[PDB]
Amino acid sequence: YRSKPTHGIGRYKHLVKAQVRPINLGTDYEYGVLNIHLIAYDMALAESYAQYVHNLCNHLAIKVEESYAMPTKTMEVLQLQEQGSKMFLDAVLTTHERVVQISGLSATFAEIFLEIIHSNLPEGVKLSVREHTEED
């Protein structure tokens, strides 16, 4: 009640707000909107390392925005048969891809990050650093 010392006690909504550019200043240098593509043949492997990434970022205070799985790519591999000369034979594979997006960075946290990233890389796992623009 406006005239009281206590006005605004209940007031909250500034507290919860329920309602892109990299900033490069060359000194405090914020390079944001970064895309980590985790690509591998094994689902369990992919999901595991993805998990590890996401959690790592959660602990490092670096803020993750979007963690999502990109479309799987189905490979058909044709192998030469020696008996029939130009005769082909076949075997099937699948490539899985996960993505973890970080909204903020500084030079020192990149230097630091990449280290733990490729240090802790699993066997049969391939890694990618990119920028936010891609098309699904």
Binding site: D42, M43, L45, S48, Y52, N120, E123, G124
Partner: protein
């Protein structure tokens, strides 16, 4: 640290039998693919 995230099972609720497979791409390198066919090995040309 290579063994960090290497230890897992597939967490989906309903799924096929997954069997360890050795996979040779064209390097001389080998990978472990967990794949439904019991076959010990497969190799790409």
């Amino acid at each position: 640290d290579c063994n960090r995230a290497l230890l897992t099972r597939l967490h989906r609720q309903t799924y096929a039998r997954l069997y360890p497979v050795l996979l040779v791409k064209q390097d001389g390198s080998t990978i472990h693919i967990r794949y439904r066919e019991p076959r010990r090995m497969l190799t790409m040309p």
